[PDB]
């Protein structure tokens, strides 16, 4: 019996089906009071919400769903018809995420793909009928942020104005990605200082807006 299963059960027993906000609150309570977990959390979550509301993206890709906290956070603010694709390599966590979204009533807005970003990204166009992405949320292995950004570009998935939003650019940190986007003319970057989920430790989000070649 895992921490992730305990989080899901806590949601199911302490939130209201179909009420995404109650789901977020339940997860944040459990992770504050019972067991820490690597959800983006409320501090960084509020910044995410402000970004999502600014851009109202029609198609979002998330790398690293975990238990679905960020997927619930984003999907609850998407406009009608807008969609989120989220990728998760750990099959147990993919299943938790699907159940989390089902409980939240967000399952028609989100597709949870069980697999590795580097395998799935090149299939997005032909298999998932993607043209280009409006926003990408990076929250998977930190050493994959840079390679998968470059892969997204190679596959023609970025357009002028695509918003990349990256978790954990301070802790654990993603130093190659951060140096790269901040030094590249193809990205316009902004740093949003915040706190590591459920902890009094500084962390932050980076927004990197793609500008084309």
Ligand X SMILES: O=C(NCc1cccc(CNc2ccc3[nH]ncc3c2)c1)c1cc(-c2ccc(F)cc2)cc(O)c1O
Q: Which residues are catalytic?
A: 139, 142, 167-168, 197
Q: Which stretch binds Cl ion (CB under 5 A): 3-11, 42-50, 96-104, 142-150?
A: 42-50
* Cβ-Cβ contacts under 8 Å for 105 (sequence gap 6 or more): 17, 18, 19, 20
Q: How many Cβ atoms sit within 10 Å of the Cβ of residue 79?
A: 9
**Is 26 one of the binding residues for ligand X (CB under 6 A)?**
no
**Is 168 one of the binding residues for Mg ion (CB under 5 A)?**
yes
Report, in Å, the least distance between residue 128 CB and ligand X: 15
**Is 87 one of the binding residues for ligand X (CB under 6 A)?**
yes
Which partner, Mg ion, Cl ion, ligand X, none, binds residue 43 by CB below 5 to 8 Å per kind?
Answer: Cl ion
Which partner, Cl ion, Mg ion, ligand X, none, binds residue 141 by CB below 5 to 8 Å per kind?
Answer: ligand X
Report, in Å, the least distance between residue 161 CB and ligand X: 24
3-class SS letters over the chain? CCHHHHHHHHHHHHCCCCCHHHHHHHHHHHHHHCCCCCCCHHHHHHHHHHHHHHHCCCEEEEECCCCCHHHHHHHCCCCCCCEEEEEECCHHHHHHHHHHHHHHCCCCCEEEEECCHHHHHHHHHHHHCCCCCCEEEECCCHHHHHHHHHHHHHCCCCCCCCEEEECCHHHHHCHHHHHHHHHCCCEEEEEEEEECCCCCCEEEEEEEEECCC
**Is 45 one of the binding residues for ligand X (CB under 6 A)?**
no
With CB under 5 A, what is the number of residues at the site for Mg ion? 3
**Is 194 one of the binding residues for ligand X (CB under 6 A)?**
no
**Is 90 one of the binding residues for ligand X (CB under 6 A)?**
yes
The structure tokens listed for 48 are: 């995410």
Of 28, 88, 134, 139, which lies in the binding site for Mg ion, with binding defined by CB under 5 A? 139
Q: Which stretch binds ligand X (CB under 6 A): 122-130, 139-147, 156-164, 179-187?
A: 139-147
Report, in Å, the least distance between residue 42 CB and ligand X: 13
Report, in Å, the least distance between residue 70 CB and Cl ion: 4
Contacts to Mg ion by CB under 5 A: 139, 167-168
């Amino acid at each position: 019996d895992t921490k992730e299963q305990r989080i899901l059960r806590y949601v199911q027993q302490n939130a209201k089906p179909g009420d995404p906000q109650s789901v977020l609150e339940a997860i944040d309570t459990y992770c504050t009071q019972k067991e820490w977990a690597m959800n983006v959390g409320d501090a960084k979550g509020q910044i995410m919400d402000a970004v999502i509301r600014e851009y109202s993206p029609s198609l979002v890709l998330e790398l690293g769903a975990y238990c679905g906290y960020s997927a619930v956070r984003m999907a609850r603010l998407l406009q009608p018809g807008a969609r989120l694709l989220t990728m998760e390599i750990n099959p147990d966590c993919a299943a938790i995420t699907q159940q989390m979204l089902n409980f939240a009533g967000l399952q028609d807005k989100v597709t949870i793909l069980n697999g590795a970003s580097q395998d799935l990204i090149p299939q997005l166009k032909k298999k998932y009928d993607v043209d280009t992405l409006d926003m990408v949320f990076l929250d998977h292995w930190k050493d994959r942020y840079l390679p998968d950004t470059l892969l997204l570009e190679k596959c023609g998935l970025l357009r002028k104005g695509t918003v990349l939003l990256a978790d954990n650019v301070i802790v654990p940190g993603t130093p190659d990605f951060l140096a790269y986007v901040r030094g590249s003319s193809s990205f316009e970057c902004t740093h949003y200082s915040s706190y590591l989920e459920y902890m009094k430790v500084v962390d932050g989000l980076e927004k990197a807006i793609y500008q084309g070649p």
